Amino acid sequence: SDDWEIEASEVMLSTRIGSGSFGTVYKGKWHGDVAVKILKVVDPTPEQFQAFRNEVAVLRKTRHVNILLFMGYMTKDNLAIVTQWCEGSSLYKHLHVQETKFQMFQLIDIARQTAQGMDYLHAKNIIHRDMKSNNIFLHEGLTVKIGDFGLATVKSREQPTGSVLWMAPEVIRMQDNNPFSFQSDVYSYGIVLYELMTGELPYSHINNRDQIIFMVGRGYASPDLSKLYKNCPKAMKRLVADCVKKVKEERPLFPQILSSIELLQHS
Amino acid sequence: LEALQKKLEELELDEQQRKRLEAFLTQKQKVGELKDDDFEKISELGAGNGGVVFKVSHKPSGLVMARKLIHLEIKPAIRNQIIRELQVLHECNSPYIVGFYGAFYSDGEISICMEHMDGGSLDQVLKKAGRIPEQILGKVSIAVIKGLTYLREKHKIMHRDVKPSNILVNSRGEIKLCDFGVSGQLIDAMANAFVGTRSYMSPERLQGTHYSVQSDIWSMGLSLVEMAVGRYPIPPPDAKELELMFGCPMAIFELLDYIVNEPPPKLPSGVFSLEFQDFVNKCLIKNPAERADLKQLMVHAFIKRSDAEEVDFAGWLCSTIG
Ligand SMILES: CNS(=O)(=O)Nc1nccc(Cc2c(C)c3ccc(Oc4ncccn4)cc3oc2=O)c1F
Ligand SMILES: CCCS(=O)(=O)Nc1ccc(F)c(C(=O)c2c[nH]c3ncc(Cl)cc23)c1F
After folding, report:
1. Which residue intervals define the domain Protein kinase in the entry (chain B)?
2. Which of B161, B188, B257, B312 is catalytic?
3. Interface with B, mutate which of A22, A158, A175, A180 (most B CBs under 10 A)
């Protein structure tokens, strides 16, 4: 194939980390610790084989310290992608399971690094299409790594896993054939910003996914910004609101988001 | 143990039902606290509906069970509270409610172990039967109407998710409800962790206004139509598709928007009885106050007809799946 295909006898699968509907993530060993995402597909069609090598080609173009390091793929026995192993947990687990006590300067740093990675992807014409705090990993706690981008080619193939909490209204309504854009990614980044600056998920008082889908698509519901931390800088509060705006064209792009954070960081 | 049997005698059972309920409670006493190591996998009985479900054998007892794996990332306090709130299912013993054995948390998944049903869900039954005969949809209606009133009187609970895949059936002709909202923390957890392709949600619940068991009646009516014809009805059938099922897709938001704005679906006239049509029309009233409630449904003409009709449900089921 190309020189990033990995032979299966070289990889030793260890423990099971996560398991969605589109695949399963194992910790493994391949010249040190590694992560293997194995796709739940036993009869991969010539069509799905091509979409996989296409999404692998996109993964092949990313080399950045805030993007999860692609390392190789497997296409014979099964469809899988091998990446670096992050020693910390995902940002979701930090904020919503362990409830780790980040300080304000660390929340801004996570925000800035995430924006740094997203800026890189868009500069390479990559749209994440599914950004949440589940997909942001803290390698050893200090540096964020963005993953679970790509394979939107293969994901589009009753009640599966996934979430609506990070979906832009234009993406929820799905009225265009392609509602995904740099600003739909900005909205998702905005919701991650909300998580960072409140400690909890949006729409915490609504417990009905179908209510959330309807209410957010109509404009009757939006993240409650009154729950932002009191120590949250007032410029950061503006940035949450700017990224979360209902209008797709009113949202900042990541060069501006970066600058907003960088000038804030100059205390 | 016998506190469970005292609550059996507070119900209006017949001779064959008390036999089976008493036999299930004695099997509940064979099993203790459940764990992942205690189970041997047999087959797979489902993939959607909020988690994979396996047919399994509990080694110490020998019992066959259904094990629902619900994957959720939640802080340990919520895990323990979800298992605490699920223990009310030990006290949910009714002919119209599937049984409970125990619940526990392992790996990153809440395991719920419950009564096995060899007939499967009416969702699974429908895709083999094409459409469900009306005589049987009468018997199914009774089971649902009775299970909802059992929950509201003996437990003060709503189902919150009445759909074809949450009605299960037995080779013994039993029709029971499952996957109802016992744990408030589990309700919150599964809204954030899953996505939906279709909806049986009442328009008042979609809009955030006050709701009651009337929302479940709306869901029953929407499920009955979907089982009568062989298709989800939110996008009403084409003038062609109707003439392709009896002879002589929208995204989730567009569905939810349709359920709120456009008139409710109806049973196609001429192929079904008039009372059954009036029955679903009384279930699919948008305004909940003028929608039929549970007592009116039990005295509606369609139910008194169906309750008297002796049907071989168990027979039809084993004929259409095997
Ligand atoms: C779509 N409606 S919603 O209100 O938004 N969400 C929910 N609706 C219902 C329910 C829930 C959550 C929930 C689920 C999914 C469940 C599944 C199996 C189960 O086991 C069992 N065993 C024996 C007998 C009957 N059940 C118990 C269960 O209790 C719950 O609270 C919603 F999250
Ligand atoms: C270069 C990105 C490849 S991806 O976009 O397909 N995503 C992907 C592929 C394979 C994976 F294993 C993962 C993944 O979930 C993790 C990668 N490294 C990790 N470290 C810790 C945890 Cl909990 C999870 C992961 C992952 F996000």
Report:
1. 39-303
2. B161
3. A158
Task: Name all domains of chain B by residue range, CATH numbers in brackets.
Answer: 3-115 (3.30.200.20), 120-320 (1.10.510.10)
Phi, psi of A185 (to 5 degrees): -65, -35
Domain boundary among A62, A84, A106: A84
DSSP code of residue B294: H
- CATH code where residue A24 lies: 3.30.200.20
Torsion of CA B129, B132, B136, B140, to 10 degrees: 100
Which residues does a chain break follow in chain A (C to N more than 2.5 Å)?
157
DSSP letters for B224-253: HHHHHSSS--SSPPPHHHHTTTS-----HH
Resolution in A: 2.9
Query: Does residue A143 sit in the same domain as residue A103?
Result: yes
Method: X-ray
Is A207 close to B191, i.e. CB distance below 8 A? yes
Q: How far, in Å, CA of A26 to CA of A220, rounded?
A: 40
Quick one: tokens of A148? 């679970």
Same domain, A174 and A243: yes
Ligand 1 atom nearest A207 alpha carbon: 5
A93 part of contact set with chain B, CB < 8 Å: yes
Q: Which tokens in the block code for residue A251?
A: 């949202």
Identify which of A99, A173, A220 has the shortest CB distance to residue B253.
A173
Q: Atom 16 (ligand 2): residue with closest C-alpha?
A: A35
Q: Are residues A74 and A102 in the same domain?
A: no
Residues A106, A53 share a domain: no
User: Ligand 2 centroid vs B299 CA: distance in angstroms?
Assistant: 57
The whole-angstrom separation of Cα B24 and Cα B40 is: 21
Structural contact between residues A64 and A144, judged by C-beta atoms closer than 8 angstroms = no
Residues of B in contact with A168 (CB under 8 A): none
Q: Which atom of ligand 1 is nearest to the CA of B92?
A: 24
